[PDB]
């Protein structure tokens, strides 16, 4: 299952290409400006076979909880209503969100103790790096 090394509180320390990623999602200008200024905290925990992931920022908070491989309803930070699935692939926690015939993937993996999130939407790739705190 998911490595226990994922468990904990993570703080964003770097974000590359988030603006174009948000544009690809259809996020408006004012929202993107605040999104680009946000430095969220991401909290990953485990309750039995349920995995909650909570995101906290001054602008927006989100929370999802899921079992691996089981589709669930998700409300995203930009208020998309998606059907989502999280899978585990070579130690990577891979989230796919589907809505209105579109899809985006968020892949989270551990790299030298940091958590690296890769966000992909229509060929646009955003990389966000988190430190454990
Ligand atoms: C996660 C960002 C929370 C608040 C800032 C975002 C503002 C508007 C929503 C547009 C971004 C929606 C996609 C967020 C993907 C975050 C992936 C991650 O770093 O965990």
Author numbering: 0 to 132
Q: How do the authors describe this structure?
A:
P2 is a small 15-kDa protein with a β barrel structure covered by an α-helical lid. P2 belongs to the family of FABPs, and in all crystal structures of human P2, there is a fatty acid inside the β barrel. An important feature of P2 is to bind lipid membranes and to stack them into multilayered systems. Recently, three point mutations in the pmp2 gene, coding for the myelin P2 protein, were linked to autosomal dominant CMT1.
The largest difference is triggered by the T51P mutation, which decreases the area of the β sheet β1–4. The mutation hinders the carbonyl group of Ile50 from forming a hydrogen bond with the amino group of Phe65 in the β4 strand; Pro51 also cannot form a hydrogen bond to Ser44 in the strand β2. Two water molecules in close proximity to the residue 51 and the β2 and β3 strands are not found in the crystal structure of T51P, but they exist in all other structures. Only ~5% of T51P was soluble, despite optimised cell lysis conditions. P2wt, I43N, and I52T remained 100% monomeric for 24 h after SEC, while T51P was 98.3% monomeric, and high-molecular-weight forms were already present. Tm analysis and CD spectra illustrate a drastic reduction of the stability of all patient mutants compared to P2wt (Tm = +65 °C); T51P has the lowest Tm, +41 °C, and already at +38 °C, the conformation of T51P changed and unfolding started. In MD simulations, palmitate-bound T51P is overall much more dynamic than the other P2 variants and shows strong fluctuations in the lid region as well as in the β sheets β2-5 and the loops connecting them. In simulations of P2, especially in the case of apo T51P, opening of the β barrel at the gap is observed. In addition, multicomponent analysis of the SAXS data indicates a 7% fraction of open conformation of T51P in solution, while the other P2 forms exist in the closed conformation. However, T51P showed a reduced capability to stack lipid membranes; the turbidity of the vesicle-T51P mixture was approximately half of that of the other samples.
